[PDB]
Amino acid sequence: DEKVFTKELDQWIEQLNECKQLSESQVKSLCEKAKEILTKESNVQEVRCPVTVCGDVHGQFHDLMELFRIGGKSPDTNYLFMGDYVDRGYYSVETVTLLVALKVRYRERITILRGNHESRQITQVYGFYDECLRKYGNANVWKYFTDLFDYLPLTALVDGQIFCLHGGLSPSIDTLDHIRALDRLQEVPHEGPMCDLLWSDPDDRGGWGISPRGAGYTFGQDISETFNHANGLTLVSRAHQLVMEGYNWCHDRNVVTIFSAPNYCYRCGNQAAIMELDDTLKYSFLQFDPAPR
Amino acid sequence: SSQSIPTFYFPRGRPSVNVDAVISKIESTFARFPHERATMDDMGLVAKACGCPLYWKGPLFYGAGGERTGSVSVHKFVAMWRKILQNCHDDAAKFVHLLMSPGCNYLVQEDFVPFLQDVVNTHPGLSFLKEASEFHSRYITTVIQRIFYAVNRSWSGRITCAELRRSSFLQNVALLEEEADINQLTEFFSYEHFYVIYCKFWELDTDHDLLIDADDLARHNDHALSTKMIDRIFSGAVTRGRKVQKEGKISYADFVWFLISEEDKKTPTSIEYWFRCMDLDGDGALSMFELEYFYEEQCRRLDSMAIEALPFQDCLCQMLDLVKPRTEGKITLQDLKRCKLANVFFDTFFNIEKY
Amino acid sequence: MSLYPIAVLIDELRNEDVQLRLNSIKKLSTIALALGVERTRSELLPFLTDTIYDEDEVLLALAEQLGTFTTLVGGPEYVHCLLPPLESLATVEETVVRDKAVESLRAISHEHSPSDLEAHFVPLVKRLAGGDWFTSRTSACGLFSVCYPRVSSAVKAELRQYFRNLCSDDTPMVRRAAASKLGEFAKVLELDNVKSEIIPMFSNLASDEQDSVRLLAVEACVNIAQLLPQEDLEALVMPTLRQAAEDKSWRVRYMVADKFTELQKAVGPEITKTDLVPAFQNLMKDCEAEVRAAASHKVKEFCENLSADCRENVIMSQILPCIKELVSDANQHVKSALASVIMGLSPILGKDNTIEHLLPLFLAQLKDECPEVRLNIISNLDCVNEVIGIRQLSQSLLPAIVELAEDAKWRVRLAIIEYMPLLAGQLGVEFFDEKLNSLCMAWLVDHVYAIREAATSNLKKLVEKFGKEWAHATIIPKVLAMSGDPNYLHRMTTLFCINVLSEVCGQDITTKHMLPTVLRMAGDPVANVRFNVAKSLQKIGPILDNSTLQSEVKPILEKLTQDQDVDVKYFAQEALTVLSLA
Ligand SMILES: [Ca+2]
Ligand SMILES: [Ca+2]
Ligand SMILES: [Mn+2]
Ligand SMILES: [Mn+2]
Asked: Which residues bind Mn(2+) 1 (chain A)?
C-alpha cells in the first residue's frame, strides 16, 4: 500500500540519478505529495544537527552528483539546501525533481528552502520555463513546480542556533516570530519581508542600504550582530551570492555565504562548498571543483 | 501459413469505392459544356465532380493533355481519371500519378510547375502575380523548394508517395480554397515568406546572374556567418554533383535551402544541412578537431569585437552538457536532433548575431 | 510455429511506437523462416524496402538482419534480391547505418557466384560510385575489395577505373573515404597493378591538400608494405612515409608515430635499423606535444622489436639520450605517457644498464610534481619488479605514495587508493603493515565521502590478498574503534566497513567480532546511524546462523521498529521481512 509507492519512488530516484527525467504525470503526482508535506513545515523550519548545508545549484545536475560524492548519499547524510535549484543550467528539471523526490522519500533527512529563483517571474526569464517546455511538450510541469515552490519554507533554524536563509536579513523583520507570522504560500513579492529574505545581501557598508540587484536590502555587520544577539543565534548561514572560494565568512563570522554551483554557468571560475555541522553543531567546510565530463 | 499469415504486401494498395458513380458525375458535368469539352475556366466544376479539392484542377487538366489545345474532351478526361481510380487507392498516390513522368512513380521539381502555375493564376491572394514575370517565376521556384525541404526528407531528388503521405502537403493544397489570404498558409505557399527570401537573395546577387558566390554569401546578414562555414556551403556537403565545387557558385534554388536553414536550425532538415557542413571528414561524428577548426574563428571574431571568448575547453564542456550525446566524446547527428538545442550548438560555432 | 503472433509481428513493422518496430525488425529472422523462402522474397523484402524510419536503432537493426538473410531467401541463387534494400540503406543520412549497410553487402558478396557479381553486385557499386551525393560515393569505396578477386579481367579493369575516380573526386569527404579503403583494395589486386596503379593513387592522396586525406596514407603505407617484397620498399613506399614524417600537419605526423609499430613490423628490421630509428628520434623531439606524447608511448614496443644484433647498441647510443630529454619535457601528457611504459625497458637492457641508466630516470619521475606522472610509474613496476628487486625500490616508492595518499586533490587520493591492493601485493604484508596500514586507516576518515567509500572497499580488496586472520589482527580493531567518533559520518563508515568485510571474513569472525558492535550502535543518538544499523543487519544476516538471528538480532530490529524516527522504523521493518524474522 505505502510500500508499493515507496519502491515506485525509489525507482524514480534511481532513474533521476541517471539524469533521466520523470514524466509529466509522475511529476504531477510527486508535486501533490510534496505540497502535502511542505504545507506542514513552518516558515522557520526546526532542523536538528547533524546536517550538511548547501547553497545555489542552479540546474548544474552533474555538479550536484559531485556534491553527493563529497558529502555522502542521501539518506545516509542529512542535507539542508538553501534554494536556487533551478534556472541557468541545462538540467534544472532533473535537478529539482531529484531534490523534491528526496524530500518526499525522506521527510526528515533533507530540508529544501526557497531561493529567489523558485519564482514564476524569474524562471520565465532565466531558463527553467523554456527547459520544461523543451522537455515536456507543454507548460504544466513548470506550472506544477511553481505551485510547489510557493509551499517551500523560507528559513531554517538548526538547533535553535544557526539560521539558514537563501538571501539575507530584512528591515521589516526583527525576530523569528515575525517570520513565522508571515504568509509564505504565495509567489515572491517584488518588495516586503518575504522578498527580502530571499533577495538581501551582506555588505562592507554599515546599516541597511538598497540592493544593487533591484530587490531587497544590503546589510552590514552592525545589523547582523543586532539580529543574532536579539534571536540567540551563533551565525547566519546563507547562499545567493557567488563567492569565488565556495564559502565566505563575513561580519566577523556572524554570516557565512555558501555557494554550491562550481564554475557558475561555465564561466565564473569559482569553487563550490558545503558546510557540515556535526553532532554538536560544530562547523567544517568542504570545497569542490566541478565534475569532469 | 498461407492462411494464418494472409498476404500483407500490395504492389498498388488495398481498397470499396464506386468508380462508375464518379465517371457518371464527371459525364453529367461535362454535358454542361460546348461540345462536351472542358476549358481551364470549367475545371473547378470538374475537380469537384472528381471528388477532389479545387486546386487539383490544374494537375487534372494537365494530366489529360488539356493545355495542348486549351480544352480537353470528356472521353479523354474520363479515360485517365478512370485509370487513376483503378490504380491509386489514396490521395498521395493519385496526386503523384497525375503529375509524374511516365514510368517514374516519383515527383521531380519540374513536375510541380503546372500545379503551381495554376495556383498563381487562380488564387485570390496572388492576383497581382498573374503577369508572366520575374517575381512570378521566382515565387514558383521558391515554393517548390519549400515543398522539397519539408517533404523529401531523403534528399533524393524524388518525392515519393510514402513521403507525400507522411507530410502535410496535401492538407495545404486542400486549405487553398478555404483561405483567401495566402500568408495564412505559412508552411509552403506564403507569399510574405517568399518575399523575404527573394529580397535577401536579390540584394546579394548584384550582377543579377541568378547565381551567387562565396564572397556574395559572406555579405549576408553583415557577415554574421563565419567564413569557414561559408566556404563549406560550396564544398559538396549540401549540393548535388560536381558543378558547385568547380565554380564556387550556387543557384537561387540552393540559396533557398541555405536561407531556410539559417532562419530556423531546430528543424530536422536544417540539422542535417548544418551537420553535413560541420562533419569536415564525413565520418558521421564531430571530432574535437572539427569543432576547434570552427571555434578558433569564432574566437578571433569575438576578439575583434572586444568580447571575452569562452576558452575552447570550457566551451566543449558546455556543448557536451547541452547536447547529451549517447556515446561519450562523439557528437552525432542523432544526438543533435534529440537535444532540442541544436540551434544554440550551431550558433555557438559559426554565428555571431548576439550581438 | 504459431503463426498468429508472427503475423502480428509483421503488422507491428508499421506501428507508431519505435520499440514495437524495433522488436519486429530484430525478429525478421523468425518472420522470414515461418513464411518460408518463396514469400520472404515476393512480399517481405518489397514491404520492407518501402518503409521509412527516421530512427537509427531501427535502420541499423534492419541492415544487420539483411546481412544474415541468404538462407532465408533460398540461398546463393537468390541473394541478389537483398541488394535493393541495402542500396537505399547505403544512402541514408546517417553514417552509422550507411557503414552497417556496407558491412552487410560485404558479407553478402561471398554468396554471389562470379556471374552474379558481374551481373548485379557490380552494377550496384557503379551506381553508388556515380551517385549524386558524396554520402553515396563514400559507401561505394568499401565494396571494391570484396568483389574484385572473383570477377573477369575486363571487369577488374572497370573497378580499377571507378576506384581511381573516387580517389580523384572533387569532394574531399570521398577522397578520405577512398584513402581509408586503399590498403584493403590493394591487398586483392595483382602485384603488377599494385605497382602501376595503386602506388600512383597512394602518392597523390599522400600529398592531397586536406590533411584528413593525407593522414590516412600512413595506414595505407602499412598495408602496401605488407603486400610488397622488401627489396621494392625503399623505392615505392619510403619516400612517401618519409614525406609523412616531416609533413606540415601535426595530425599526419601523429599518425605515423601512432602507427610506428605496425610500420616497423611491416617494413622489415633492415629498414627499421636504417630509416625508422632516425625518423623516430625526430618524432620524439617534435615541436607539437601531442606528437611527442604519441611517440613516448611507443618506446617499449619499438625497442623490443629491433633485430638483436643492433638492438642493444642503438637503444643505448641513440634512443636513451632522447628519453633523458623527454623526462624533463615541459608537457605533462608527454611525461606521463612515457611514465606508463618507460620501466618496461629494463628486461630489454639487463639489470646492468637498468641500474646505471634507467634507475635514475624512474627516480626522477617519482619526484615529478605532476601526479599523473607518478601514478603512471607507481602502477607499472610489475615489469622491472621481477627483473630487479621491488625490495630495492621500496625506500623510494614510500615517500611518493605518502605524498599522493595525502594530496589536496581528492581525485589524486582516489587514484592511489585504487592502486593500493596491487602495491600491497608487490611489497608484501610485512612492509604493508609496517608502513602502509596507517595510510589506509587515515582514508577511512578522509573529509570526502568518495574517499571514505573507496577506502572501505579497498579493505575488502586487502582481505582477499592477505586472508581473514590478518584482517582480525591488523584491521578490525581500528575499524571498530571508529564507532566512538563523535562525528556521525565517521560512525556510519564503521558500519559500511563491516558491510563489506563480512563478505570475506566468514561467519565466526563476523558473529563474534563485528556483530556485537553493530547491535550496540542501535542506541546511537543520531537516527542516521540507527537506521544503518538495521540496513547493516540485513546485509550481514545471511552470513549468520539462525540461532544468532533469532536470539540476538531479532530483538534489536524489533526494538528499532518502535523507534521514534520514521526511517529507522522503516528499515528495521525491511530487515525483519527480508531476513524472514517477521
Ligand atoms: Ca551573381
Ligand atoms: Ca568528423
Ligand atoms: Mn542564485
Ligand atoms: Mn539567489
From this structure: 56, 58, 84
Nearest by CB to B236, from C42, C51, C170: name it: C170
**Which residues 408-427 of C are in CB contact (within 8 Å) with A?**
410
Identify the sign of the CA torsion A85, A86, A90, A91: positive
Per DSSP bridges, beta strands A162-165 and A235-238 are parallel
Q: Is B67 annotated as a binding residue?
A: no
Which is it for the CA torsion A69, A75, A79, A81, positive or negative? positive
Neighbours of chain B (3+ CB pairs under 8 A): A, C
d(CA C214, CA C533): 64
B contacts of C36 (beta carbons < 8 Å): 1
Residue identified by cell 507548460 is A139
Contacts of C267 (CB under 8 A, 6+ apart): C225, C230, C233, C237, C275, C276
Listed residue (B317, C451, B312, C489) closest to A63, CA to CA: B317
Nearest to C213 by CA among B304, A158, B283, A33: B283
Rounded to whole angstroms, the Cα distance separating B2 from B163 reads: 31
Which residues in chain A are closer than 8 Å to B322, comparing Cβ atoms? 90
Instruction: Please tell me which of the candidates B162, B241, B282 has its beta carbon nearest to residue C52.
Output: B162
- Residue B144's Cβ-side half-sphere holds a number of Cα atoms within 13 Å equal to 24
State the pairing for strand pair A44-47/A155-158: parallel
Cβ(B102)–Cβ(B22) below 8 Å: no
Distance to chain A for B292, nearest Cα, Å: 18
Topology of domain A1-293, CATH? Purple Acid Phosphatase; chain A, domain 2 (3.60.21)
Angstrom distance (rounded) from CA C579 to CA C577: 5
Instruction: Count the Cβ atoms, other than its own, within 10 Å of residue A79.
Output: 24
Identify the helix (H) or strand (E) that includes residue B136.
Answer: helix B134-151
Q: For residue C219, give the C-alpha cell.
A: 595506414
Q: CA A252, CA A230: separation in Å to the nearest integer? A: 17
CB atoms under 10 Å from CB of A252, counted, come to 9
Query: Is the domain covering B101-195 a CATH 1.10.238.220 domain?
Result: yes
Domain ranges of chain A: 1-293
A257: which strand partners? A238, A248
- Beta strands A208-210; A217-219: pairing state: antiparallel
Mutate to test the interface with A, among C372, C483, C567 (most CBs of A within 10 A): C567
CB contacts, 8 Å: C492 with chain A: 72, 76
Angle between helices C277-284 and C320-328 (to 10 degrees): 10
Q: What's the CA gap between C357 and C373, in Å, rounded?
A: 19
A178 catalytic? Reply is no
CA distances in angstroms from C422 to B163, B232, C381, C403, C429, listed in the order given: 61, 53, 10, 18, 12
Residues 6 or more apart whose Cβ sits within 8 Å of residue C521: C483, C491, C494, C495, C529, C530, C533
Task: Residue C248: name the closest of C215, C223, C216, C204 by CA.
Answer: C215
DSSP B47-81: HHHTT--GGGHHHHHHHTT-TTTTEEEHHHHHHHH
Strands A79-81 and B37-39: unpaired
Q: Which fold has domain B196-277+279-355?
A: Recoverin; domain 1 (1.10.238)
Contact present, C225 and C205 (Cβ < 8 Å): no
Q: Tell me the domain boundaries of chain C.
A: 2-582
Asked whether A64 and A19 are in contact (CB, 8 A), the reply is no
A165 has which bridge partners? A155, A238
The SS3 of residue A276 is strand
Q: Using CA atoms, how far apart are residues C342 and C381, in angstroms rounded to an integer?
A: 10
Fold for the domain defined by C2-582:
Leucine-rich Repeat Variant (1.25.10)
